[PDB]
A paper describes a structure:
Cryo-EM screening showed that the protein was in the trimeric prefusion conformation. Spike was then mixed with an excess of CR3022 Fab and incubated at room temperature, with aliquots being taken at 50 min and 3 h. For the 50 min incubation, collection of a substantial amount of data allowed unbiased particle picking and 2D classification that revealed two major structural classes with a similar number in each: (1) the prefusion conformation and (2) a radically different structure (STAR Methods).
The causal coronavirus (SARS-CoV-2) binds host cells via a trimeric spike whose receptor binding domain (RBD) recognizes angiotensin-converting enzyme 2, initiating conformational changes that drive membrane fusion. The heavily glycosylated trimeric surface spike protein mediates viral entry into the host cell. Spike exists initially in a pre-fusion state where the domains of S1 cloak the upper portion of the spike with the relatively small (~22 kDa) S1 receptor binding domain (RBD) nestled at the tip. The RBD is predominantly in a “down” state where the receptor binding site is inaccessible; however, it appears that it stochastically flips up with a hinge-like motion transiently presenting the angiotensin-converting enzyme 2 (ACE2) receptor binding site (Roy, 2020; Song et al., 2018; Walls et al., 2020; Wrapp et al., 2020).
Author numbering:
A (entry chain C): 27 to 66, 81 to 143, 165 to 172, 188 to 242, 264 to 298
B (entry chain C): 745 to 827, 854 to 1140
C (entry chain B): 992 to 1090
D (entry chain A): 745 to 793
E (entry chain B): 299 to 620, 641 to 676, 689 to 744
The structure:
Amino acid sequence: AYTNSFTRGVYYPDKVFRSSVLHSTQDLFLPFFSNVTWFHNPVLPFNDGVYFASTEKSNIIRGWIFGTTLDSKTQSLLIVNNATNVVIKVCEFQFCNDPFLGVNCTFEYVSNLREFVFKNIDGYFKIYSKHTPINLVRDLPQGFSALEPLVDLPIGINITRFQTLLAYYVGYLQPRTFLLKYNENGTITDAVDCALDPLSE
Amino acid sequence: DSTECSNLLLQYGSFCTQLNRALTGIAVEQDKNTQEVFAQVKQIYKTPPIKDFGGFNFSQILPDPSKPSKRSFIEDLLFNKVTKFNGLTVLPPLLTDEMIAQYTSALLAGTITSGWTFGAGAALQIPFAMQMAYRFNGIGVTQNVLYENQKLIANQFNSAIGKIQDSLSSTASALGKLQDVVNQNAQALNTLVKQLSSNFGAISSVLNDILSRLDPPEAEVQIDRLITGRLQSLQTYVTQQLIRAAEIRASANLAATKMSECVLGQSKRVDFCGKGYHLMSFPQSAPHGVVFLHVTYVPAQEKNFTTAPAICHDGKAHFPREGVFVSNGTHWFVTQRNFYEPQIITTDNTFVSGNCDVVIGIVNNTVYDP
Amino acid sequence: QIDRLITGRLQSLQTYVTQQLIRAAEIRASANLAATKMSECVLGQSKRVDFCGKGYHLMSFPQSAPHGVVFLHVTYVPAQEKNFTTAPAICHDGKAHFP
Amino acid sequence: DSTECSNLLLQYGSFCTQLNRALTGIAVEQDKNTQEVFAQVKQIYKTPP
Amino acid sequence: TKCTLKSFTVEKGIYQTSNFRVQPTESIVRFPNITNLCPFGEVFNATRFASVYAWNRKRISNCVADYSVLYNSASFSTFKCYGVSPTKLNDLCFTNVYADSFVIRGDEVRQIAPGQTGKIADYNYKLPDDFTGCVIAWNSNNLDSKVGGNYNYLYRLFRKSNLKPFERDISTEIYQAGSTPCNGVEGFNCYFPLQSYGFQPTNGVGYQPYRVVVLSFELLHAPATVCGPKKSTNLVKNKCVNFNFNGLTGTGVLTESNKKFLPFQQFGRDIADTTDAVRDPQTLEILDITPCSFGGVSVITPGTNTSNQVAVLYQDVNCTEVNVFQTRAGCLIGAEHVNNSYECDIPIGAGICASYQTSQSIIAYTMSLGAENSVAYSNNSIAIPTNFTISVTTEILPVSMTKTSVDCTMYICG
Ligand SMILES: *[C@@H]1O[C@H](CO)[C@@H](O[C@@H]2O[C@H](CO)[C@@H](O)[C@H](O)[C@H]2NC(C)=O)[C@H](O)[C@H]1NC(C)=O
Ligand SMILES: *[C@@H]1O[C@H](CO)[C@@H](O[C@@H]2O[C@H](CO)[C@@H](O)[C@H](O)[C@H]2NC(C)=O)[C@H](O)[C@H]1NC(C)=O
Ligand SMILES: *[C@@H]1O[C@H](CO)[C@@H](O)[C@H](O)[C@H]1NC(C)=O
Ligand SMILES: *[C@@H]1O[C@H](CO)[C@@H](O)[C@H](O)[C@H]1NC(C)=O
Ligand SMILES: *[C@@H]1O[C@H](CO)[C@@H](O)[C@H](O)[C@H]1NC(C)=O
Ligand SMILES: *[C@@H]1O[C@H](CO)[C@@H](O)[C@H](O)[C@H]1NC(C)=O
Ligand SMILES: *[C@@H]1O[C@H](CO)[C@@H](O)[C@H](O)[C@H]1NC(C)=O
Ligand SMILES: *[C@@H]1O[C@H](CO)[C@@H](O)[C@H](O)[C@H]1NC(C)=O
Ligand SMILES: *[C@@H]1O[C@H](CO)[C@@H](O)[C@H](O)[C@H]1NC(C)=O
Ligand SMILES: *[C@@H]1O[C@H](CO)[C@@H](O)[C@H](O)[C@H]1NC(C)=O
Ligand SMILES: *[C@@H]1O[C@H](CO)[C@@H](O)[C@H](O)[C@H]1NC(C)=O
Ligand SMILES: *[C@@H]1O[C@H](CO)[C@@H](O)[C@H](O)[C@H]1NC(C)=O
Ligand SMILES: *[C@@H]1O[C@H](CO)[C@@H](O)[C@H](O)[C@H]1NC(C)=O
Ligand SMILES: *[C@@H]1O[C@H](CO)[C@@H](O)[C@H](O)[C@H]1NC(C)=O
């Protein structure tokens, strides 16, 4: 299955405040109105960044695995929110053939629609996210919202493939130029994909 | 704020100095432009408390004595329609807006109360109706026209001023020219400032990062790349400013000529002072510019007449002294060219020359002898 | 080393040439103005106001000068004046007489 | 048609886009020149046969 | 002015000769709160240490390493760093640091060093010849000795070959000293490869236990997570400073700001990519960075022919930050403010002009636009001239320049 990524996947590219400003920036964004794979635990590629999204009523999706082999051969990020506690590990874990939860470690940390952006640049694993209420079943909602950064991991583990841990969506970022509009309060209120159509160009 | 960068910069000689010198020349030139456009009157004339200008109503162009800077209503409309710490400063103009307003008020009051005489010499008062009679004789329309249509002319003028107010209040793009100028300058500066964030081939756009990270022997090469880039940015900016200032100087010379010939006199150059026959002009200030309100005479309702080049009375050929022979089908008259005012043909309308066997188109008529 | 020198001196020459082009544009505009003044002021009698001096133009005389021209504008200036009463027209037999 | 050269060129910032801007300004100005010189008549008059 | 014009005489006018710029009074450095300190304590202060043959390694990552706690301590008799100064380590970040800890006897401390041989270096713990890092050692007689002799610490006595740098061998294989295989059975030419130190408190200092920690530093193709303290200072507002916030440095005046930064935003930015406000890393407040007052210094002078007295106009500054006159063009010093209006002689700006007038001094005044006048306008009164004058004016126009021609090759490559 596939679905329309109307105008979602836009995230604050940095930690710089700007007010009432139209700023043009080129980064790995989810191209507007592109195809996002829609799923109801397959292994997926991580070419150059992954926009991930989930709609929930019972907290089914729990976590993620990122890595290269994910079979206790090379380090691999494991990000699991176990029922109250967020745990991030980068141990050379040995994973199951189908790693489901019952219905050498170099780092370790412990702490409706949800959007996440997982990208890996120069050994840093940027995780952006945004939570919102929603009343919709069969598809992503249409509208605009910007994603705050939440985690910047110094992990250094290079990632090629990944998998989810339990309806969700996967889209793939591309190196595109965007025009971002910042209102008086420093927040992104609109965006224009600079390679979508001639009017946007 | 970088000693090492300044030491490197001193090797390029006087590029910096001549850039500064060019910009200073531009600034002085701008002050000269404004001075030569507006300061064309040696004295500051002021209108009397009486507004007895023959029915013409100038209240929307004369200064408002209870107002921001003693500007007229239209000047205020014009002013409401037109809208750092990196080594860039903006020097203030030598003539403040209040002084420009005083100059245009002087020009306007001199024009109203004296005509063109204040430009030629001492301002000699003259009733405004008589001044308009002069301005009508200046376009080939006898003055009795004005004196017999004075109320209509005054009402048309007042309505035209009202329409000008409406046009300026409704359409902002009316002042596009001025606005464009401002935009251009701003954009240039923005571009210049943004050029500080480029690398030009260095490892970083931040001079301090290069200095703090690299050893001097290589930080020097990186800073040389940055210096060449930024010096080229400055040179491009200054050259664009020079060319654009030439543009503005040409327009300022044109505006000075228009004020001299159109406001301080009555021009006869076609379409120099608007479409129509020029009667007068009124200057108004505007941000970094001037606005001329050209009052012109435009013939409106026209008629078909039969015409002749001369008439044959006793074998003599009679030509019109000033006018043209016309016929309404039965009788012949001699009217002025620019306005149908037919008059009986008499030997003081026409002058004799030759006989009827040479002119091609001579007609027959009787020339009354008073 | 010579490449650095050549780039510097070539840049200086380009700057000089560009400034000269703009300055020559200035001078060409002024030369056109002077030619127009000679045509309309010396070879005729201009009626353009303030084009040929303050006052009503009578004539002009051109004088050479180093890299330029100097016009002596002879103009007419009204000097002494009087207040008079004035009228736009006068009734004689009911009819209006205008000057 | 060189990606590496283009990536090097965009290190200079707006050294190129402003050249394009200046040239387009010149072109618009040329059209304005021609219109000012010739389009001084509102209607197209015609001589009689 | 005389130098800036390269002349000993200066014509009447207003010249810009230099730039006024406030200097920074002091320096401020601000870094985030120093937390997540590296756990050196669990290495240096561990109650039990490893045997040298089984030396422990602790990985130090993602933390602030306050090396001073180590190099200012009086608790160490050996503190020897090769290729690095621990003081400069405070300014450096590494992907990993490694603390290798063990116990040897005093006479063997010298063997923990590059290019050394002996029992310990050959068979137990080996440093590389190009070792970069530190060796720290202190006597542990009070902790590792016992009256009856502490034998819990072991060393490897036999091995088939020398250790490679940082190699760790914990095998208890029976050492085959002869040609007969041992098959795990001890006997003639078949020896256990380990032997206990005998640590008694009355031993000579050369035979007393010493605890040793070796610090190694590692940079990988991964984020550098072990960084030095990088202490900060107090911040002062409303006065020009040179500042260094988390990653940015500059000069300006820091003032309480008006902006509402998002919880994750650190630096403000103007439209033209200029830093505008900063978030203080320790106090969650936003500080506007207004760059320190600066501007041109113009010299207003009559011709040196007439006088050598000058007035100085500081452009776009207050009269506190430099017979003083505050004009819209800046602060003017040495020019006497007069109420009377005159014709403009030396233009200053915003309608102010300065001139040298009578006993004589330089004065600044709002320039006059000309004598005011009224025309006695009435609806039935006209003024007619009765005489005239013939006036000859003089208009000077440049026509041409000098025809300079420049030889490019001769100018450039003489
Ligand atoms: C000249 O025209 C102005 C209007 O342009 C007249 O001012 C108006 O006067 C009426 C009556 O007092 C007011 O209701 C309007 O609001 C005024 N309009 C403006 C724009 O001021 C003025 O009265 C006219 N001059 C004379 C002498 O009548
Ligand atoms: C052409 O004009 C003449 C003069 O205006 C007209 O003759 C006059 O006609 C009026 C009547 O409207 C008489 O009262 C005058 O006495 C006439 N004047 C003379 C001198 O005869 C003439 O009728 C006009 N022709 C046309 C076709 O309208
Ligand atoms: C997504 O791809 C499918 C074909 O794979 C196409 O039919 C659809 O139009 C695409 N989505 C959009 C928004 O164009
Ligand atoms: C910005 O936030 C304030 C509250 O802090 C709010 O009052 C204001 O309306 C917001 N601005 C916009 C444009 O929403
Ligand atoms: C004048 O007459 C011509 C015919 O000769 C006609 O075409 C034209 O419309 C007339 N003008 C007016 C104003 O009626
Ligand atoms: C005007 O044209 C007509 C038509 O040919 C001709 O008969 C007449 O002689 C001409 N008259 C003049 C004065 O041109
Ligand atoms: C005018 O009248 C004369 C006689 O007086 C006659 O010879 C001539 O033909 C007439 N011309 C016209 C154009 O009617
Ligand atoms: C005309 O009368 C006015 C009185 O208002 C006076 O000011 C003016 O000087 C007089 N003109 C001459 C030339 O005397
Ligand atoms: C940082 O530590 C200081 C004590 O040194 C404390 O006063 C301050 O509240 C801390 N800041 C934060 C953001 O916790
Ligand atoms: C180790 O413990 C001692 C107790 O005397 C203490 O002074 C020292 O600071 C501690 N060092 C570390 C690194 O924990
Ligand atoms: C200026 O000073 C010189 C002496 O250097 C003198 O010869 C000249 O007359 C002076 N001129 C004026 C106008 O003061
Ligand atoms: C500088 O002077 C202006 C008035 O010209 C005043 O408003 C301002 O407060 C002064 N500066 C300071 C720091 O007070
Ligand atoms: C100028 O006049 C003002 C009053 O308008 C007065 O306060 C001030 O002291 C006067 N200055 C001088 C220098 O006379
Ligand atoms: C006109 O002015 C001249 C001086 O230029 C004087 O000699 C002459 O007498 C004046 N004439 C009259 C009539 O005032």
